[PDB]
Amino acid sequence: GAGPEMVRGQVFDVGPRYTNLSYIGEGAYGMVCSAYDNVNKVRVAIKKISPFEHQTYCQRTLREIKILLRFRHENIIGINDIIRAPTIEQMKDVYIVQDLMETDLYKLLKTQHLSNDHICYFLYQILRGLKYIHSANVLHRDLKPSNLLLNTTCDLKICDFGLARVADPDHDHTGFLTEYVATRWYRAPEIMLNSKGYTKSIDIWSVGCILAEMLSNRPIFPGKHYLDQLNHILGILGSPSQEDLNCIINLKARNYLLSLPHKNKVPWNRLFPNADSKALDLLDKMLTFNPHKRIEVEQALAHPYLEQYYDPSDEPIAEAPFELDDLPKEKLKELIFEETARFQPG
Ligand SMILES: CC(C)(C)NC(=O)CN1Cc2ccc(-c3nc(NC4CCOCC4)ncc3Cl)cc2C1=O
Nearest CA, atom 31, ligand 1: 160
- Taking a C-beta distance cutoff of 8 angstroms, is the pair 167, 139 a contact? yes
The yes-or-no answer on residue 326 being catalytic is no
Q: Say if ligand 1 is within 6 A of residue 82 CB.
A: no
Q: Which homologous superfamily is 101-325 in?
A: Transferase(Phosphotransferase) domain 1 (1.10.510.10)
- Taking a C-beta distance cutoff of 8 angstroms, is the pair 86, 108 a contact? no
Residue type at 87? T
- Taking a C-beta distance cutoff of 8 angstroms, is the pair 42, 20 a contact? no
Distance CA 129, CA 316 (A): 9
Q: If you ran DSSP here, which 8-state letter would residue 273 be given?
A: T
Distance CA 216, CA 212 (A): 7
Tally the C-alpha atoms within 13 A of residue 7's C-alpha that lie toward its C-beta.
Answer: 21
Q: What is the dihedral of CA 120, 206, 99, 67, to 10 degrees?
A: -130
- Taking a C-beta distance cutoff of 8 angstroms, is the pair 272, 280 a contact? yes
Question: Of the candidates 44, 20, 139, 42, which has an alpha carbon nearest to the alpha carbon of residue 96?
Answer: 44
| CA of residue 4 relative to chain centroid, distance | 33
Q: Say if ligand 1 is within 6 A of residue 21 CB.
A: no
Question: Of the candidates 32, 29, 30, which has an alpha carbon nearest to the alpha carbon of residue 21?
Answer: 32
Domain ranges of the chain: 1-100+326-346, 101-325
Q: Which listed residue (81, 93, 142, 203) is catalytic?
A: 142
- CA angle, 187 as apex, 171 and 206 as ends, to 5°? 100
Greatest CA separation for the chain: 71
DSSP string covering 64-79: HHHHHHH---TTB---
Question: How far, in Å, is the centroid of ligand 1 from the Cα of 91?
Answer: 21
Nearest CA, atom 21, ligand 1: 103
Q: If you ran DSSP here, which 8-state letter would residue 186 be given?
A: G
Distance CA 21, CA 326 (A): 36
Distance CA 64, CA 342 (A): 16
Question: How far, in Å, is the centroid of ligand 1 from the Cα of 272?
Answer: 31
> How many Å is the Cα radius of gyration of the chain?
21
Closest ligand 1 atom to Cα of 27: 10
- Distances in Å between the alpha carbon of 236 and those of 128, 158, 169, 187, 265? 28, 28, 27, 15, 6
Distance CA 201, CA 169 (A): 10
Resolution reading in Å: 1.8
Closest ligand 1 atom to Cα of 77: 28
Distance CA 108, CA 209 (A): 16
Sign of CA dihedral 58, 79, 97, 138: negative
Contacts 24+ apart (CB under 8 A), 338-346: 339/62, 339/65, 339/66, 339/69, 340/65, 340/82, 340/84, 340/94, 342/69, 343/81, 343/82, 343/83, 344/86
Which technique was used to obtain these atomic coordinates?
Answer: X-ray
Phi and psi angles of residue 205, each rounded to the nearest 5 degrees, phi first? -55, -50
- Residues facing residue 76 across a β-bridge: 158
b/e per residue 195-207 (b: at least 16 CB within 10 A): bbbbbbbbbbbbb
Question: Of the candidates 85, 101, 87, 91, which has an alpha carbon nearest to the alpha carbon of residue 32?
Answer: 101
State the burial class of residue 85 (Cβ atoms within 10 Å of its Cβ: 0-12, 13-18, 19+).
middle
CATH number of 1-100+326-346: 3.30.200.20
3-class secondary structure, 344: coil
- Taking a C-beta distance cutoff of 8 angstroms, is the pair 2, 15 a contact? yes
For a ligand 1 pocket test, name from 159, 163, 336 the mutation site with the most ligand atoms within 8 angstroms of its C-beta: 159
Distance CA 49, CA 52 (A): 9
Distance CA 203, CA 23 (A): 31
Q: Compute the residue count for the chain.
A: 346
Within 36-115, residue ranges assigned H as helices are 55-70, 105-111
Distance CA 128, CA 311 (A): 10
CB atoms within 10 A of CB 10: 16
Binding residues for ATP: 24-32, 47
Nearest CA, atom 24, ligand 1: 103
Question: Of the candidates 195, 192, 127, 120, which has an alpha carbon nearest to the alpha carbon of residue 165?
Answer: 195
Q: Say if ligand 1 is within 6 A of residue 103 CB.
A: yes
Distance CA 43, CA 58 (A): 28
- Taking a C-beta distance cutoff of 8 angstroms, is the pair 47, 12 a contact? no
Distance CA 64, CA 159 (A): 9
At 125, which helix (H) or strand (E)? helix 116-135
Question: How far, in Å, is the centroid of ligand 1 from the Cα of 47?
Answer: 7
b/e per residue 266-288 (b: at least 16 CB within 10 A): eebeeebeebbeebbebbebbbb
- 133 Cβ contact list (under 8 Å, min separation 6): 71, 76, 139, 140, 158, 203
What are the start-end ranges of the E strands in the chain? Answer: 18-26, 30-37, 42-49, 81-83, 94-99, 103-104, 138-139, 148-150, 156-158, 165-166
Within 187-276, residue ranges assigned H as helices are 189-193, 201-216, 226-237, 242-246, 251-259, 268-271
